[PDB]
């Protein structure tokens, strides 16, 4: 029981550290998608108003 509790602490720390690296990579993709969505929506309203 002491060996299983000690091994569970190492698995929980590795799962928490791996989740932080995935959240940092997803935040960079969400920031680039948010800026591209604002530029694509503004280009559609500017093209229809100039024609």
């Amino acid at each position: 029981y002491a060996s299983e509790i000690s091994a569970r602490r190492n698995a929980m720390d590795n799962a928490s550290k791996n989740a932080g690296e995935m959240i940092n990579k997803y935040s960079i993709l969400y920031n680039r998608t948010r800026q591209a969505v604002i530029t694509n929506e503004l280009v559609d309203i500017i093209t229809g108003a100039s024609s």
């Binding site: 960079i28 680039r32 591209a36 530029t39 280009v43």
Partner: protein, 500 residues
């Protein structure tokens, strides 16, 4: 519902007599704004020709329609008003070139900004020059020594090839181009004209304080006497920063067409794409991806295609291109990152993760590669570094997931090779000193030393091999290869020095 050209002011001049001044070369400025100048006239003016305003600002006539001509001003918008008299130079957008530009800092139009007086130019080459074909080109065979131990053994560069330098901010993009220009002092100060390479730093998009500090460091180490500096800060107009890549390529092309080598460093490639999109957005154009025009890929592919290696019938010269790409968070699949990687023969990725841990410079072995770098390298450095690129990429993936017997041998040999190849700033090595340090780490002669003693072992082995065995170091630099007698003498000297 109406039309432009003749309107109010321009419609009251043709009813009387619109003569006097020559309207074929000159013209009246009808409108000015957003870096443009709608000049009324210019009938005999050709396309992409140089112009001049009344206040002294230069101009470039882009579009030539009926009754009007769109002139792109290369300076501020306050130097051109409504009703000014412009003038054409009669030629296209050219710049000064020749051997007299070595040692001075020029700008985008070729004027000197260092205060050393005029430049003794031997000609006048246009900025928009076509690249050579397949008949006046040859394969890259000359070696380009950069000075870094991690660049001359992994992805080497050659004369006539285009090696990109992608990466993020504060990773090692501008540091790799500065070390290669300062390492050419051992061949340019001698009498060998084929081994010399004239540098061509084109600082585009950089600040004003960064351009003045970089020119002072190269002059103190005897490296600014044979290097062209193209100053192009961000405080000027958008036409000056966009034309900095075309003006720097015309000055370096004179040495390749006569019988000399040249090395161009376009720092940076990301700053040149933002300046060209600003002038195109103000002229009512269609924006594609990332707010860029349709001719964004054609502007970088035309300027990089001219830096090639000529054949023996054209002079035998070559031109090397070193473009630095500034990535946003390591995004290598961007719009400006995919266009520079598809036109250059190799790239040097600079990751920001290994740059903060001490590995300077952070060169990824699994991402950076060289197309024409295998045949355009030294035979002495390639023979001592057997399978160096394949062992460096496999050691990084095994260490990230890790105690077996086979994994312990690859982890100890991979850690000593990465620390020994990491050099400091402004500390380039020759081809004879880098061949003795790379042969000890690949043969197992550095596995018995500690991890912290990797920096002390490189300085002690280079000093002992230059006084106790001078015949082996001079033979690797003159001949460039190692036979059976040279390989046996290098293994005996490294084993006796490691035990003491």
């Amino acid at each position: 519902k109406a039309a432009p050209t003749e309107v109010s002011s321009i419609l009251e001049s043709k009813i009387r007599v619109s003569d006097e001044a020559n309207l074929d070369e000159t013209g009246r400025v009808l409108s000015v704004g957003d870096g443009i100048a709608r000049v009324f006239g210019l009938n005999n003016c050709q396309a992409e020709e140089l112009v001049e305003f009344a206040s002294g600002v230069k101009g470039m006539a882009l579009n030539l329609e009926p009754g009007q001509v769109g002139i792109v001003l290369f300076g501020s918008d306050r130097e051109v008003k409504e009703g000014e008299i412009v003038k054409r130079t009669g030629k296209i957008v050219d710049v000064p070139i020749g051997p007299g530009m070595l040692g001075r800092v020029v700008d985008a139009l070729g004027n000197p900004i260092d205060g050393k007086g005029p430049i003794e130019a031997t000609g006048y080459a246009i900025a928009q020059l076509k690249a050579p074909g397949i008949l006046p080109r040859r394969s890259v065979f000359e070696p380009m020594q950069t000075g870094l131990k991690a660049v001359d053994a992994l992805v080497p560069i050659g004369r006539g090839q285009r090696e990109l330098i992608i990466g993020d901010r504060q990773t090692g993009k501008t540091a790799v181009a500065l070390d290669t220009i300062l390492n050419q002092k051992r061949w340019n100060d001698g009498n060998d004209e084929s081994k010399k390479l004239y540098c061509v730093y084109v600082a585009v998009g950089q600040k004003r304080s960064t351009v003045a500090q970089l020119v002072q460091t190269l002059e103190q180490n005897d490296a600014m006497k044979y290097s062209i500096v193209v100053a192009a800060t961000a405080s000027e107009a958008a036409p000056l920063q966009y034309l900095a890549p075309f003006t720097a390529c015309a000055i370096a092309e004179w040495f390749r067409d006569n019988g000399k080598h040249a090395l161009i460093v376009y720092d940076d490639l990301s700053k040149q794409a933002v300046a060209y999109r600003q002038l195109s957005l103000l002229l009512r154009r269609p924006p594609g991806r990332e707010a860029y025009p349709g001719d964004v890929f054609y502007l970088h592919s035309r300027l990089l295609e001219r830096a090639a290696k000529m054949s023996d019938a054209n002079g035998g010269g070559s031109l090397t291109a070193l473009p630095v790409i500034e990535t946003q968070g390591g995004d290598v699949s961007a719009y400006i990152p995919t266009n520079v990687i598809s036109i250059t023969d190799g790239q040097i990725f600079l990751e920001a993760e290994l740059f903060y841990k001490g590995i300077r410079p952070a060169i990824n072995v699994g991402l950076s590669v060289s197309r024409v770098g295998s045949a355009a390298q030294v035979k002495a450095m390639k023979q001592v570094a057997g399978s160096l690129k394949l062992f460096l990429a496999q050691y990084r993936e095994v260490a990230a997931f890790a105690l077996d017997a086979s994994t312990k041998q690859t982890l100890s040999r991979g850690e000593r090779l990465t620390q020994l190849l990491k050099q400091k700033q402004y500390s380039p090595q020759a081809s004879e000193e880098q061949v003795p340090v790379i042969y000890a780490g690949v043969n197992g002669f550095l596995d018995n030393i500690p991890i912290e003693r990797i920096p002390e072992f490189e300085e002690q082995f280079i000093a002992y091999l230059k006084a106790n065995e001078g015949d082996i170091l001079e033979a690797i630099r003159t001949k460039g290869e190692l036979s059976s007698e040279l390989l046996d003498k290098l293994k005996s000297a490294t084993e006796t020095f490691v035990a003491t």
